[PDB]
Design goal:
- The protein has one helix at residues 19-23; strands at residues 4-6, 9-13, 25-29, 34-38, 54-59, 64-69, 74-78, 87-96, 107-110, 113-122, 125-130.
- It is mainly beta.
- It folds into two domains: 3-44, no CATH class; 45-139, no CATH class.
- The protein is globular and about 40 Å long.
- The two termini are 25 Å apart.
- The structure holds ligand A1BOO and zinc ion.
- The site of ligand A1BOO has 19 residues, from strand 10.
- The PDB classes it as hydrolase.
- Keywords: enterovirus, protease, crystallographic fragment screening, XChemExplorer.
């Protein structure tokens, strides 16, 4: 679990969005596993606007942060799960690192701010949904 809180927006994994997220929907994209909802309170986070390919992520299943080298956002095949059919997930960045069910929503940060959130895992890999291209989150 986990979310990004920026301005009057909450960014969560689309497959973990709540009834309240859907009632206050701003934007969602099944191919990216992202959903953004509106909030009444001002958020605690800053979004990176950069091309970093190194950063640190929080892994809830280890209660630890880990440094990672990750690929640029791209279209990657993801196996069918209870949440989605087998499909290509877009804007996804992969890295070598631990990730298991429950780690979705952990934040990946670089020196410039929030880069994205955990969205996929298994086999000693961790995949992050990028948010750096969503410039409207800043306004
Ligand atoms: N479509 C998606 O964005 C995800 C929805 C939930 C299921 N997805 C996963 O990747 C799963 S279990 C997995 C393990 C090995 C190979 C494939 C999947 C998982 C594991 C670790 C962290 C987060 C999620 C895909
Ligand atoms: Zn950066």
């Amino acid at each position: 679990s986990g979310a990004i809180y920026v301005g009057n927006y909450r960014v969560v994994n689309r497959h973990l969005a709540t009834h309240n997220d859907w009632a206050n929907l701003v934007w969602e994209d099944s191919s990216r596993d992202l959903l953004v909802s509106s909030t009444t309170a001002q958020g605690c986070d800053t979004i990176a606007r950069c091309d970093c390919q190194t950063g640190v992520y929080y892994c809830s299943s280890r209660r630890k942060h880990y440094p990672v080298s990750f690929s640029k956002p791209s279209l990657i095949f993801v196996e069918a799960s209870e949440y989605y059919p087998a499909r290509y997930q877009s804007h996804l960045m992969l890295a070598v690192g631990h990730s298991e069910p429950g780690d979705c929503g952990g934040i990946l940060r670089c020196q410039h701010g929030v880069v994205g959130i955990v969205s996929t895992g298994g086999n000693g890999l961790v995949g992050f949904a990028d948010v750096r291209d969503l410039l409207w989150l800043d306004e």
